[PDB]
Amino acid sequence: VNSFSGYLKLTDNVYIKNADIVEEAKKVKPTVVVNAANVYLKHGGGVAGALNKATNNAMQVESDDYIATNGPLKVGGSCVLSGHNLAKHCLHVVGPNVNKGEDIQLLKSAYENFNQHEVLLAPLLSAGIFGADPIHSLRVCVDTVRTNVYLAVFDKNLYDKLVSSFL
Numbered sequence: 001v002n003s004f005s006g007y008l009k010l011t012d013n014v015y016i017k018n019a020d021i022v023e024e025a026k027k028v029k030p031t032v033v034v035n036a037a038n039v040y041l042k043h044g045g046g047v048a049g050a051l052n053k054a055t056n057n058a059m060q061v062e063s064d065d066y067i068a069t070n071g072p073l074k075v076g077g078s079c080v081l082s083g084h085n086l087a088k089h090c091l092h093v094v095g096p097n098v099n100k101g102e103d104i105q106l107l108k109s110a111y112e113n114f115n116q117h118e119v120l121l122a123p124l125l126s127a128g129i130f131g132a133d134p135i136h137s138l139r140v141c142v143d144t145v146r147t148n149v150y151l152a153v154f155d156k157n158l159y160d161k162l163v164s165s166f167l
């Protein structure tokens with residue numbers, strides 16, 4: 001039993017809700033919140049910009065030190081950093097950005113990072129400003145993640161479409 005509330009159950013392990021991931025994280029304080037990161041951990045917009053703003057830029061400060069030490073992530077890769085005031089940990093995961101011409105097959109690799117964590121709050125990878133089809137992202141999520149994932153879909157209109165089209 002966990003403290004996530006109001007989710008629709010899609011499969012044995014995937015749950016979905018129309019919600020703002022920032023406000024959800026602040027309420028639940030999950031062990032792991034997933035960020036929709038880029039390889040440089042430049043949290044400008046989308047989910048990343050919103051999470052960083054909620055940390056008063058502490059996420060960006062920590063991220064800049066991470067990059068200075070380690071260099072960029074790989075597309076499809078991830079790193080674990082602090083969750084600041086939002087969660088114990090933040091798993092920064094880089095899904096392909098279609099608006100940069102990145103390979104969509106890497107979306108499965110991106111979701112595989114979730115399997116290293118027993119429970120996560122997460123967005124649909126590569127959705128929103130990353131330019132992928134959210135229905136496809138949800139399909140890859142369900143077919144790749146085996147751990148317990150609580151998906152927050154910000155757009156209510158998008159949430160309703162995701163539920164009604166789910167196979």
Ligand SMILES: O[C@@H]1CCN(c2ncnc3[nH]ccc23)C1
Nearest residue numbers: 020021047050123127128129154
């Ligand atoms: O890529 C799409 C576009 C934005 N996005 C989000 N998902 C869940 N919570 C969020 N809060 C702020 C943005 C956001 C997914």
